[model samples]
Target chain A: EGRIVLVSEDEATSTLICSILTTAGYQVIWLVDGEVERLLALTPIAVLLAEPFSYGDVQELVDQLRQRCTPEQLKIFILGSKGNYQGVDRYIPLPIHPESFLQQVTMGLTSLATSAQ
Target chain B: MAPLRKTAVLKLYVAGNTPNSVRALKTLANILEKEFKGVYALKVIDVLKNPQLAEEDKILATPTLAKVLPPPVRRIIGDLSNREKVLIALRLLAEEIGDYKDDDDK
Candidate 1:
């Protein structure tokens, strides 16, 4: 019931992540780049930004995304080390474990739903 | 490397013939074949007819999965919707498995 927007440049990792999420029944969209027109068109409960961006740039994107949806409504996840961004709800490390990765996503979505209510 | 492998015995507790019970059974059955290792026995127990057995096992919910053999007995309550969690609960999977592949690929 949750739409997840995944932002990653790695082709293989994106495929792997999408496979796991789609199998788990979450509608996943792999956003290859941070394009405003592409992001503004869809409603996503959560956005996962995998590495390959400066923290400041990532926060800038987060800032623009927050303008459209509240922190409670949209969960910002960084699939890398801890960032200096305040908008990020959770940080997942690299070399992703399939199960734990899925669990984190599920937990974030559940927490968002619980807090939003 | 031939240490006598203990047969894994699992008990799945269910309440009548319901959606959760059926779904749990199907998913668990698939996991047993694909994920589980050698020598396993799965016993499906219905709490509706065997209330006494449920009481004996201290089962509080339907579609509860209990690992009886291969000690450190554990139980998980759900329809077993998540395969990884069930495997982790049974000690078949850890935080990460090197060379991981989807069941469909195999």
Candidate 2:
């Protein structure tokens, strides 16, 4: 019941997230390099800043989304690092445990979001 | 068109302006530019135009790259998405042609 929207600077990482969630039966939408407002329109259950060794591009994106959506409306997650950037709610440190990450996202979003559940 | 019979005659069969088809065309050009650089003939065929000929060639789908020269034919399907796979295919073709030349020398 959750739609996952992913934004990133590169194709490969976004494509990776696309394959993982999509095949497992989540509706995954991804656009590379600054696709922020377009992402907000779909009203994803969660947003993944899926980058492999990069972040400011993601940092700026989360900031932009915060300008646009209320907290309950969009749940944002960082794939690596605990607290380098200022806005956004949660961070998942990586070498990526996909199951735990997704399990937690589905878990966390459901609890945080009133409309989405 | 008759067989080009050039050193590396290529025929790219595409499914009518699809992204992979377009991307395959661009990737083929880039591959040639980067790897072989001239002396190869390329023919871009739209299978949407020649369904029968496409069937005759047994073109199962769009964005199929065919190497139609230097004896037995070969093809690799898709958008040349993996650059390494494309490079490996091109390198094998070079080796196959070199083998043919060595036979001439013998």
Candidate 3:
């Protein structure tokens, strides 16, 4: 099975998360500022990591992604900053610890696998 | 044959020409065109240049898509990669109100 596709505005954050997920034994596809069609074409994405970074309209991109994919096919995890975690599905608070972050990744991937089976 | 009616008004707020913004614009265009067809009106707004509109919509992040018209406005935020989440949100909105309301409400 293909790995999950992660879209993040922050290159550093994306790289960090990719490393964690990779170490956890989950495949991860990292894209910084990637096009929507390209991401959609790679369907059956396990989870999408929307990291906080200096971007134009991050929420708008999240909304659009939600509009295109189905719930079973795509799980959204928003890496929020300080206290901006209200409207998203899964919100990982900023300044995340490596262990906690890894746990979240494992949980998310395990959930996806369980649901699929 | 009867007269046609207008569909929902969806505004996707984007910022600059970033990867997320580009992805959102293209994916949303494709999804709306396929699903709503002629029933919906989609407007893509760039908040970087149009900061005023961003404030109006209370957009805190980039790539936010809001259902402006059709009552009980709904909003979603992401990079437009998760189709399942998108479909669920849309379904919730459609269930809350009615799908494809008459254009007379405009």
Give the TM-score of chain A, superposed on the true chain A, for all candidates in the order listed: 0.86, 0.74, 0.74
lDDT of 3 by residue, B1-106 (tens): 1332224556667765577666665565555444544444444555665478688777889778777656677787775655666666666665655544558777
RMSD (Å) per prediction: 17.9, 17.3, 17.7
- For model 2, residues A6-107, the per-residue Cα lDDT tens digits are 655554455455555544545454433343434543456677776652434666777888888866666788776663666656677767665776676666
Interface RMSD of each: 18.6, 18.3, 17.5
Q: Which model scores highest in DockQ?
A: 2
Local error of candidate 2 at A51, Å? 2.9
Task: Tell me model 2's lDDT, rounded to 2 decimals.
Answer: 0.60
In candidate 2, stretches whose alpha carbon ends up further than 4 angstroms from where it belongs are A52-56, A83-86, A113-117, B1-106
Error of 2 at B13 (Å): 21
Q: Model 1, range B1-106, lDDT digits (tens) per residue? A: 2323224456667654566555665566555544542334455565765478788888778878786655677786764867666666655522222234558664
The better-scoring model by DockQ among 1 and 2 is: 2
Highest TM-score model number: 1
List the DockQ of the predictions in order. 0.01, 0.02, 0.02
Quantify all predictions' global Cα lDDT against the true fold. Answer: 0.63, 0.60, 0.58
Question: Lowest summed lDDT over 10 consecutive residues: which window, candidate 2 chain B?
Answer: B1-10
| Model 2 error, position B81 (Å) | 27
What fraction of the true interface contacts does model 2 reproduce? 0.00
In terms of lDDT, the poorest run of 10 residues in model 1 chain B is B91-100
Candidate 2's TM-score reads: 0.45
Q: List the residue pairs that clash in candidate 2.
A: none
